[PDB]
Nucleic acid binder design. Structure first.
Lengths: 836, 100, 79, 108, 95, 150
RNA sequence: AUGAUGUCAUACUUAUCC
């Protein structure tokens, strides 16, 4: 597969056709890389495996020699990068002692993955450095990575710090401690100590909550940098304290203890970024102190906190913001003091159009404001920010809107007075009437506001729903779906207040849009109908179901991901609840239409589908519909079938399977194999759902499992084995064990194979058989296999014997046989032979 | 599980944080990965639920809405008395789908 | 003091953390000692089995419990 | 008044396998003094060459006039070469001696 | 080897071991760094240190030959300091 | 002590316009084009047009008192290195018929000389679109000049 | 008459996934 015009430089050796005459042939055959980089997806797959199994063969040297240039390529893609990352992982699951010379030679390319805009790139990078460090040795990593500490560029120092974070997560803090503790005391130059401290931080972020045990030692390291003559070291130091305390869940306060007294002092004398950093640290600290000591100390911090609102620094504003959250979100702080001193400057400087356009500042601002509401109360905050709902820009409106949302979510709408409530509803409608983008914030916002107001909202309905219909035209593509969803979430409120005319409106009006050709709208429409069904009942539906349901029936062709979803859902609600209003003929047509809905690429679609199919199975009764399931061609191998199997299960539940089984068991006869294993699955899920009731049917299924478990082809043994499992859990304790032993006979030979699905299947099988039969019989099959020095039987029988061993280890005692004692050892336990 | 075989669980110490399930993974079991017979609720680890890691799904890892529960077949097989089955690793799933 | 033996990790796999499970390369004496330790723990855990073991012998319950706790470490000797 | 991406190195292609470095030096020598020139002697890279000048603007006037310029039957591919990375095939070292020298001679 | 005898850093001084470790690090690594001195300070900070872990941390730090001699020289001086009733090595009694 | 200011640094401006040995100021806008009108530089220092330079064939033209920056020297000791810059560019104007379009005309704007400039015994200020035409009596120096161009 | 490996289609599983 083709070569980009640049990649020639790398792959030129492949171009020449000289062939068939040692190492040069290994580099030459190693161009399978090219097949991984560019080509068809299958070529990438097969190539990837082929190079995985050749790891031990080719060795890490030639590979990395032929890779690292590519992953270093200036023209590298996104995908190609990620794929080469994959091959590096998969080969590094194998090679262990081999990589030692290349470790640095790896990290140099990989460390740039840690600092990246892409998140998935970062989690990948952390993963592969974890695999590398754990793969190599500790001393390998340490002795490797020293010279990058004092490197002139700070880039490598930084990304190297995150590297030490990852490797420290791998091999644990205490192993790597003396290295660090040695580093931060290095007397050569400051840059080192700066690095090592940054390492402390990135360890704090990465490990997070798990820092807890070594917190003391870590602090004892870092403390000496706060007083250092250099500035950076001080700044990054206190920052690292911050990260610690933030991962320091409400405890280890005294471990930070000796750190405080300098910090507070510094709080006085500092100008610039370092100051803000200290404020960050102290900020995360205060929640960890005692409300008495933290009373004083807090009251001291509040002053500077006030004074420093006004700085243009955005780092500043972030810090002091989150600070205000923690300091003023303290239970030991008085409302009125905040109400006077803080709120007016807070809404003055902080609420502006510089903030909201940014992302982090947006969020953090939301949170802090939410908490201030949590203390001073509701009507204050909201009352001050309502007037901004009507502000021009979107993002700002979005901000105050979600703020109001969370506020009225927590505190409740009860505190709100009347006039401010008028400004509320008008604000929310007005903001909702202009929507540049589609998003939930405005909608969830409105819904939460109304559901919180309760029936105080009643005078406002006609304005609401007037807007709802007029908007319900305007633009279908953009706003139809949105006004529809608005109805959906406002259903219950439009119900409990007992406005019936409005339910007539929404009922037939929405009924009319079911002919809408745009799917993304229609979906929202059906959703709205759904929500309306859950408030007003069956027989009171203003569009009587006789009208509605057959009008729904043809829509199932619609392909669309949202239409199919909501549609099938609603057919489910009505098919489950009333179900009498519609004649059976319509129903069976619904069936023959439902059958091909199982091509859905989405799992929830199939979910609702099968459950519905059960409901209508109740509405009619088993035989016909289970026959219509058995009609299935099985045509698709990758699933698309076994959902029908699930329908066979649930159908067998909805009316007693005590009826249904003979039809199925007969339908195993058919020579077509894939449907044979199909009905095997049907038995599996069947027993999984029936549980206890299998105390009878075990016998019926027993000989057929004999026929199936006796192998035509592996899938028979597998699926049948799964059946044995779920049967074995289900029947437990009821006294049927005998036939389960018989079936265990035929289960037992299948123990040996390398196919993952059949071996894990058999494992589940013998586990369920363990609990059902009891360990004694198991162990009596597992004894002789232990001994076997043959590199197979011992592997397996010891795997089994372990599975039997972990559970029920208490009950095994009696069943260990008598084993005679040799020369040096006494192998007879004589306690059991004490006789009265 | 049956969908992702290369995924590894957390298996950490059990805390007092009750587990939750996302709206896309609602009703699915954690160990048995089934939809019927819920018998025991899911408990999360202490490090697995802290700050932004609280209120997240165990299997899906997205925004959790409803509380997750374990299957009765996994409860009778003593598969629910193990550690916290939080999905930590995420490999060969939702990686190439972001590019398309 | 070059040892060239750093049983640290490889690819976050295996790393036995349980006690009494065993491996495929487990010896007979190690498995017998683990079975004897499991039998001693089951005798110390079950109250009815400990009562039936102490009713036969002329020793008391706490003396037999201390003897079973003292005989747990190195029951056979050669693993 | 220059785009940043262009560099003193130019990748040049659509060369014959017989071509002589005499013609090379002569032709390319119009715009400025040659820093040096490499030519692929290897099975894939034969037909390609890299030219490096004492100054960039040299190369700029070059690709200006030499754009699609002709030799034999061929119109050469003239592009500004991209050497973002140093292929790390070589290393960063040997700075100590020269830096010790400039620290010695001028004493600075 | 020489890293099999159990020792204890609580019965020995720390200020007298800094110059010998500094001379060993200057002989091994050529120049004076701040990571090796910090590693030597972290290896002796515990009251019961580990000789095998220190050898692994310094067993590969150099090349795998000078680090073994450095560990063998640091284990014998610590053993001579812990065996003495004063708590000092043999190089501190003369000067 | 590090004195951070986060202001406009000179290196980012010098890397955009990099000459051989000096900085390059007085850049043209993006609306510059090649001239197609009949206009030639007729320099008369002693009432005899010895040299002739084409202004429509070249895109840039720098004249000064330095031999390393400029291509050809000039015999004017009372003129600075950066005194005047005559560059042709099609600006937004109207023709005689009233229809709008692109007309190639020379742009006249002072670059901030120390002693200024004079054209037809009159000083012109910068940032002012003056109607520049052919056969203008200009001066290529800061104070005075004994040579005119036509 | 099994088994061996290897080019090469074909079905099946993973409730695989936009």
């Amino acid at each position: 597969p083709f070569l980009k015009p640049d990649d020639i430089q790398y792959f030129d050796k492949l171009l020449v056709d000289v062939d068939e005459s040692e190492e040069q042939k290994e580099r030459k055959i190693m161009k399978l890389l090219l097949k991984i980089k560019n080509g068809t997806p299958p070529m990438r797959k097969a190539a990837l495996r082929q190079i995985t199994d050749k790891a031990r063969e080719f060795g890490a040297g030639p590979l990395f020699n032929q890779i690292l240039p590519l992953l270093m390529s200036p023209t590298l893609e996104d995908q190609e990068r990620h794929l080469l990352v994959k091959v590096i992982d998969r080969i590094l699951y194998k090679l262990d002692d081999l990589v030692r010379p290349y470790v640095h030679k790896i990290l140099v390319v990989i460390e740039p993955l840690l600092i990246d805009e892409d998140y998935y790139a970062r989690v990948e990078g952390r993963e592969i450095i974890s695999n590398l460090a754990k793969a190599a040795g500790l001393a390998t990593m340490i002795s490797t990575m020293r010279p990058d500490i004092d490197n002139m560029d700070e880039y490598v120092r930084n990304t190297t710090a995150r590297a030490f974070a990852v490797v420290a997560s791998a091999l644990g803090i205490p192993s790597l401690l003396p290295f660090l503790k040695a580093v931060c005391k290095s007397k050569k130059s400051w840059q080192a100590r700066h690095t090592g401290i940054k390492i402390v931080q990135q360890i704090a972020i990465l490990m997070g909550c798990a820092i807890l045990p070594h917190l003391r030692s870590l602090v004892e390291i870092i403390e000496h940098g706060l007083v250092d003559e250099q500035q950076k070291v001080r700044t990054i130091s206190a920052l690292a304290i911050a990260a610690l305390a933030e991962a320091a869940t409400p405890y280890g306060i005294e471990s930070f203890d000796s750190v405080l007294k300098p910090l507070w002092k510094g709080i006085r004398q500092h100008r610039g970024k370092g100051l803000a950093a200290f404020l960050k640290a102290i900020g995360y600290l205060i929640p960890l102190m005692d409300a008495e000591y933290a009373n004083y100390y807090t009251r001291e911090v509040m002053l500077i906190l006030i004074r420093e609102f006004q700085s243009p620094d955005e780092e500043m504003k972030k810090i002091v913001l989150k600070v205000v959250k923690q300091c003023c979100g303290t239970d030991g702080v008085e409302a009125n003091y905040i109400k006077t001193e803080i709120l007016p400057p807070f809404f003055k400087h902080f609420w502006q159009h510089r903030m909201a356009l940014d992302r982090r500042n947006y969020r953090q601002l939301v949170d802090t404001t939410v908490e201030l509401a949590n203390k001073v109360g509701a009507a204050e905050i909201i009352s001050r920010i309502v007037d901004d709902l009507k502000d021009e820009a979107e993002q700002y409106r979005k901000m105050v809107m979600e703020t109001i949302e969370k506020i009225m979510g927590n505190l409740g709408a009860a505190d709100i007075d009347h006039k401010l409530e008028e400004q509320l509803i008008d604000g929310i409608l007005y903001a909702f009437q202009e929507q540049t983008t589609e998003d939930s914030v405005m909608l969830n916002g409105f819904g939460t506001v109304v559901n919180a107001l309760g029936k105080r909202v009643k005078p406002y309905l006609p304005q609401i729903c007037g807007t709802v219909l007029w908007r319900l035209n305007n633009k279908s593509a953009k706003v139809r779906q949105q006004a529809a969803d608005l109805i959906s979430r406002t259903a219950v409120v439009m119900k409990t207040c007992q406005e019936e005319k409005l339910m007539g409106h929404l009922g037939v009006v929405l009924y009319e849009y079911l002919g809408e050709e745009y799917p993304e709208v229609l979906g929202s429409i059906l959703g709205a109908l759904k929500a309306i069904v859950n408030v007003i009942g069956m027989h009171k539906m203003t569009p009587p179901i006789k009208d509605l349901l057959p009008r729904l029936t043809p829509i199932l062709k619609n392909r669309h991901e949202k239409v199919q979803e909501n549609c099938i859902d609603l057919v489910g609600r009505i098919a489950d609840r009333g179900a009498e209003y519609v004649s059976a003929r319509e129903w069976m047509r619904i069936c023959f239409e439902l059958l091909e809905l199982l091509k859905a690429h989405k799992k929830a679609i199939r979910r609702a589908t099968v459950n519905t199919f059960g409901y209508i199975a109740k509405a009619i009764g088993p035989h016909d519909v289970l026959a219509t399931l058995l009609n299935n061609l099985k045509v698709q191998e990758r699933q698309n079938r076994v959902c029908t199997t699930v329908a066979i299960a649930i159908v067998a539940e909805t009316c007693s399977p005590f009826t249904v089984l003979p039809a199925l068991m007969n339908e195993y006869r058919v020579p077509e194999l894939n449907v044979q294993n199909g009905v095997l699955k049907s038995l599996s899920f069947l027993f999984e759902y029936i549980g206890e009731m299998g105390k009878d049917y075990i016998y019926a299924v027993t000989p057929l499992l004999e026929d199936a478990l006796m192998d035509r082809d592996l899938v028979h043994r597998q699926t049948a084995s799964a059946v044995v499992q779920h049967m074995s859990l289900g029947v437990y304790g009821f006294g049927c064990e005998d036939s389960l032993n018989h079936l265990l006979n035929y289960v037992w030979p299948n123990v040996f194979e390398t196919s993952p699905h059949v071996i894990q299947a058999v494992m589940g099988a013998l586990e369920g058989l363990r609990v059902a039969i009891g360990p004694c019989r198991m162990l009596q099959y597992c004894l002789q296999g232990l001994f076997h020095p043959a590199r197979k039987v011992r592997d397996v029988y010891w795997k089994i014997y372990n599975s039997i061993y972990i559970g029920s280890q208490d009950a095994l005692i009696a069943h260990y046989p008598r084993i005679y004692n040799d020369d040096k050892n006494t192998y007879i336990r004589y306690e059991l032979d004490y006789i009265l | 599980a049956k969908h992702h075989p290369d995924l590894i669980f957390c298996r950490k110490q059990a805390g007092v944080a009750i587990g939750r399930l996302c709206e896309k993974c609602d009703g699915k079991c954690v160990i048995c990965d089934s939809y019927v017979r819920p018998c025991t609720l899911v408990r999360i680890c202490d490090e697995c639920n802290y700050g932004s890691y609280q209120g997240r799904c165990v299997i899906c890892g997205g925004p959790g809405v409803s509380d997750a529960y374990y299957c009765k077949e996994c409860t009778i097989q003593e598969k629910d008395r193990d550690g916290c089955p939080k999905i930590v690793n995420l490999g060969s799933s939702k990686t190439d789908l972001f590019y398309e | 003091m070059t040892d060239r033996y750093t049983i640290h990790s490889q690819l976050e796999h295996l790393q036995s953390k349980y006690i009494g499970t065993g491996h495929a390369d487990t010896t007979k004496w190690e498995w017998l000692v683990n079975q004897h330790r499991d039998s001693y723990c089951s005798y110390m855990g079950h109250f009815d089995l400990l009562n039936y073991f102490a009713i036969a012998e002329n020793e008391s319950k706490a003396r037999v419990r201390f003897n079973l706790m003292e005989k747990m470490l190195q029951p056979c000797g050669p693993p | 008044r220059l785009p940043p991406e262009v560099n003193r190195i130019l990748y040049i292609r659509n060369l014959p396998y017989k071509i002589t470095a005499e013609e090379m030096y002569d032709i390319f020598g119009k715009y400025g003094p040659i820093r040096q020139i490499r030519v692929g002697n290897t099975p894939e890279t034969r037909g390609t060459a890299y030219v490096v000048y004492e100054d960039i603007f040299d190369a700029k006037n070059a690709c200006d006039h030499l754009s699609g310029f002709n030799v034999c039957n061929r119109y050469l591919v003239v592009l500004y070469y991209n050497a973002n990375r140093a292929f790390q095939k070589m290393d960063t070292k040997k700075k100590e001696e020269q830096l010790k020298l400039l620290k010695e001679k001028y004493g600075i | 080897e020489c890293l099999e005898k159990k020792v204890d850093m609580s019965k020995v001084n720390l200020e007298v071991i800094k110059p010998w470790i500094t001379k060993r690090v200057t002989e091994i690594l050529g120049f004076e760094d701040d990571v090796v001195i910090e590693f030597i300070f972290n290896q002796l900070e515990v009251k019961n240190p580990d000789s095998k872990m220190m050898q692994i941390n310094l067993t590969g730090f150099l090349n795998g030959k000078n680090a073994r001699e450095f560990m063998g020289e640091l284990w014998p001086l610590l053993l001579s300091a812990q065996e003495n009733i004063a708590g000092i090595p043999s190089a501190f009694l003369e000067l | 002590k590090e004195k951070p200011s986060f202001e406009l640094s000179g290196a980012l401006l010098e890397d955009t316009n990099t000459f051989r040995g000096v900085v390059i100021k007085y850049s043209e806008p993006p609306e510059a084009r090649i001239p197609k009108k009949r206009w030639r530089l007729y320099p008369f220092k002693n009432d005899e047009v010895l040299p002739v330079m084409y202004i429509h064939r070249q895109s840039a033209y720098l004249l000064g008192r330095h031999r390393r920056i400029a291509d050809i020297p000039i015999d004017h000791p009372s003129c600075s290195k950066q005194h005047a810059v005559f560059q042709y560019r099609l600006v937004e104007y109207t023709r005689a018929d009233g229809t709008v379009g692109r007309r190639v005309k020379p742009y006249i704007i002072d670059l901030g000389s120390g002693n200024g400039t004079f054209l037809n015994n009159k000083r012109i200020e910068p940032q002012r679109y003056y109607e520049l035409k052919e056969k203008d009596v200009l001066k290529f120096g800061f104070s005075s000049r004994e040579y005119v161009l036509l």
